Design a protein around this ligand. Structure first.
Ligand SMILES: */C=C/C(=O)Nc1ccccc1Oc1nc(Nc2ccc(N3CCN(C)CC3)cc2)ncc1Cl
Length: 288
């Protein structure tokens, strides 16, 4: 169910970054992101990617508009950049709230669950990380697309036959990342294998001061060593959906500046970046 575009319609603008190269473009009075081919050697790689980018259609997944000469791909241009850039990119960094953090994660679990539910075979993302999570609509709508050791389940680089529960591990790490606005395992550093060794040994990001026990529970379950003890994405979506009742305001665009500074990890427990005062407030009104 694809679409063809005269490569003469594509108004190739400038490059944006990088498999292949990605260039901002225009096409039918809209902004568009195109993914050129780098050499003949990548002909086959582009193929498998387009077999699944047609099957897939979901709000929280990058839309493929539709062309092939030279091998190209026509996708929607997320003006907001990567979530990684929002969290840790070049200053000025935008200010965001606890509701933004939860909405981003909710929207991500929604997109992954659609892939896990794909027929006939469940499509596994295998590389869930903020660099691959793009933002649109003032940074309020997250969308998925295609040094990952920080977000990698310990059974993946273990070579074991893995499943879709490795994305659940990634999601868990991402939830800790938007709440703390910290790069996971930035203290370890070194080459990737030094993080792989740490996570494989059981190391996890530190716990968050004054984190709601429901959120702490879900986060830790998602990054259990035993994949079968991690919840399904369907379960994550459900839980995140019902928690949003206590996180209003995910619709407000990111527009306010932020001079963000990072306290060191004093005593194995880190301070969150977002504020949960409004959550404990709304929660007590329903309970007590
Ligand atoms: C979809 C997976 C993926 O890898 N996306 C992606 C990552 C990095 C670069 C390009 C990519 O592609 C797309 N990019 C966009 N939109 C976009 C806008 C701006 C930026 N910049 C601006 C600032 N610099 C410093 C860094 C990032 C990146 C991306 N939209 C769609 C797609 Cl497919």
């Amino acid at each position: 169910s694809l679409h063809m575009i005269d490569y003469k319609e594509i108004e190739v603008e400038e490059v944006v970054g990088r498999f292949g190269v990605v260039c901002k473009a225009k096409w039918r009075a809209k902004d568009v992101a195109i993914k050129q081919i780098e050499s003949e050697s990548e002909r086959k790689a582009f193929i498998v990617e387009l077999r699944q980018l047609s099957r897939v259609n979901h709000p929280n997944i990058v839309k493929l508009y539709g062309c092939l000469n030279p091998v190209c791909l026509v996708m929607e241009y997320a003006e907001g950049g990567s979530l990684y850039n929002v969290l840790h990119g070049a200053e000025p960094l935008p200010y965001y709230t606890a509701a933004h953090a939860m909405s981003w994660c909710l929207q991500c679990s929604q997109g992954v669950a659609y892939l896990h539910s794909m027929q006939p075979k469940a499509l596994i993302h295998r590389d869930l990380k903020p660099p691959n999570l793009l933002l649109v609509a003032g940074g309020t709508v997250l969308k998925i697309c295609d040094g990952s050791a920080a977000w990698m389940a310990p059974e993946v680089f273990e070579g074991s036959n893995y499943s879709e529960k490795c994305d659940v591990f990634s999601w868990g790490i991402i939830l800790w990342e938007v709440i703390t606005r910290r790069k996971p395992f930035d203290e370890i550093g070194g080459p990737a294998f030094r993080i792989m060794w740490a996570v494989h040994n059981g190391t996890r990001p530190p716990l968050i001061k004054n984190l709601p026990k429901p959120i702490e529970s879900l986060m830790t379950r998602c990054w259990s060593k035993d994949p079968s003890q991690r919840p399904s994405m369907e379960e994550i979506v459900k839980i995140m959906t019902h928690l949003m009742r206590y996180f209003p305001g995910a619709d407000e665009p990111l527009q306010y500046p932020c001079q963000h500074s990072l306290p060191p990890g004093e005593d194995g427990r880190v301070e969150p970046y977002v504020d949960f005062a409004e959550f404990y407030r709304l929660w007590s009104v329903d309970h007590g």
